[PDB]
């Protein structure tokens, strides 16, 4: 694919552009995410 | 595919452009997400 | 694929451009993520 | 793939451009991530 | 792959461009990461 | 692969360009990472 | 999507299940094809 | 979508289940085809 | 996606399940093909 | 994706499951193909 | 992805499961192919 | 990814599971191929 | 075309006879402007 | 075209006769401007 | 084209007759400007 | 083209007749500018 | 093209008739500029 | 092209008629500039 | 400007994509052009 | 400018992509052009 | 400028991509061009 | 400038990519060009 | 400038990539060019 | 400048990559060029 971004990308808490691929018999767990201002 | 973005992208809490692909016998769990201002 | 970014990329807490690939019988756990201002 | 970045990339706490690949019978655990200002 | 970066890359606490590859019967644990200002 | 970087790369605490490869029956543990200003 | 083929595929001169994808500024040619019996 | 084919496919000169997808500024040619018996 | 083929594939002159993907400024040619019996 | 082939693949002159991927400023040629019986 | 082949692959003149990947400013040629019986 | 082959591979003249990868300013040639029986 | 200006041009904060032309996939920003006397 | 200017051009903070032309995949920024007397 | 300027150009803080031309995959920044009298 | 300037050019802080041309994968920065009298 | 300048050019802090041309994978910076009288 | 300058060029701190040309994988920096009278 | 052409361009006798630019006190003469079939 | 061509360009007799630029007190003469078939 | 060509360029008699530039008090003469088939 | 060509370039009689530059009080003469088939 | 060519370049009679530069009081003469087949 | 060529370059009769530079009061004459097949 093709991806183009021009400007600002803001993320307080989390993941950006994560790529999990080609897994067999795989397991995982992600936790919570908080944003306070 | 083709993706073009011009400007600002704001995310308080979460994931952006996540790609999970090509999985067999796979399991996972994502937690909650809070936004306070 | 093709990836192009021009500008600013801000992440308070988390992962950016993570790539997990080609796993068999794999397991892991990610923790929480907090953002305070 | 092809990756091009022009500008600023800020991460308070976390990982950037992590690549885990070609694992068999593998396990790990990542901790939490805090951001205070 | 091809990787090009032009500008500034700031990480308070964490890992950048980590590459774990070609593991069999492998285990590890990463700790937490704090960012205070 | 090909890697090109032009500019500044700042890391307060952590690892940069770590490469762990070709391991069998291997184990390790990484500690926490703090950033104070 | 889902694709199931059960039987026989016969081709004297040609290509089969050709997939060209995700191209930008591309150009090509394919010549003539002759079947004589 | 869903595609099921059960039987026989015979082609003297040509292409089969060709898929061209996700093109930008592209151009090509395919010559003549002759079937003689 | 999912692809299942059960049977026989016969090709006198040609290519099979060719995949060209993720190209930028590319160009090529393929000559003629002759089948004589 | 997922690909399953069960049976026979016969090719007098050609290529099989060719994969060209992730090219930038590329160019090539493939000559003619002759099948005589 | 996942690829399974069970059976027979016969090729008089050609290449098999060729993979060309991650090229920049590249160029090549492949000659003719003849099958006579 | 995952690749499984179970059976027979026959090639009179050619290459098998050739992998060319991670090239910059490259160029080559491959001559003709003849199969006579 | 033809453009004639005879006199005085006064600008406290801003741009003058700015010409942006012939752009494709472009993006920019201009901040605030303050005039105090 | 034809452009004639006869007189005075005064600018406290800004740019003059700026020409940006013939751009593809471009992005930039210009900050604030302050005029105090 | 034709450009004629006859007189005075005064600029406290800024750029003059700046020409940016013929750019592909480009990105830049210009800071603030202050005029105090 | 044709450019004629007859008179005076005064600039406290900035650049003059800057020409950036024929760039591919480029990136830069210019700081702030201060004029005090 | 043709460029004629007749008069005076005054610059407290900056660059003059700077020409950057024919760059590929380039990156630079220019600091702040101060004019005090 | 043709360039004619007749008069006076005054620069407190900076560069004059700088020409950077024909660069590939290049990077540099220029510090601040101060003018005090 | 931007120019894109995809297909065939045939000219028996003449010029294609001629560019004469930035001339002062210039003279020339072009001859006739014949096309016979 | 930007120029892209994909396909065939045939010229029997003449010039293609000629560029005459930045001339002062210049003269020349081009002859005739014939095309016979 | 930017120039990209993908395909075939045929010229029987003439010049291709000629560049005459930056001449003062210059003269020349080009002859005729014939094409016979 | 930037020039990219991928394919075949045929010229029976003439010049290709000629560059005459930076001449003062210069003269020359080019002869005819014939193409017979 | 930048020049890239990938493929075949055929010239029966003539010059390719000629560069005449930085001449004062210079003269020369080129002869005819014939192509017969 | 930068020059890259990948493939075949054929010239029957003539000069390739000729560079005449930095001449004062210079004269010469080149003869004809014939190509017969």
Author numbering:
A (entry chain G), B (entry chain C), C (entry chain K), D (entry chain O), E (entry chain S), F (entry chain W), ...: 1 to 37
Article, verbatim:
SAA1.1 is an acute phase protein that becomes strongly upregulated during inflammation. Chronic inflammatory conditions, such as tuberculosis, leprosy and rheumatoid arthritis, are risk factors for the development of systemic AA amyloidosis. We report three cryo-EM structures of SAA1.1-derived amyloid fibrils: one that was extracted from the diseased murine tissue and two that were formed from murine SAA1.1 protein in vitro. In vitro and ex vivo fibrils possess parallel cross-β sheets but differ in their overall topologies and fibril protein folds.
Cryo-EM reconstructions achieved spatial resolutions of 2.73 Å for morphology i and 2.95 Å for morphology ii. Morphology ii is also polar but presents C2 symmetry. It consists of two PFs that both exhibit the structure of the morphology i PF. Both fibril morphologies contain an identical protein fold. In contrast to morphology i, however, morphology ii PFs contains two non-equal protein stacks, termed here stacks a and b. They differ in their relative position in the fibril structure and at the interface between the two PFs. Lys24 (stack a) in one PF is packed against Glu25 (stack a) in the other PF. Glu8 (stack b) in one PF is opposite to Lys29 (stack a) in the other PF. In conclusion, both in vitro formed fibril morphologies contain the same fibril protein fold and differ in the PF number.
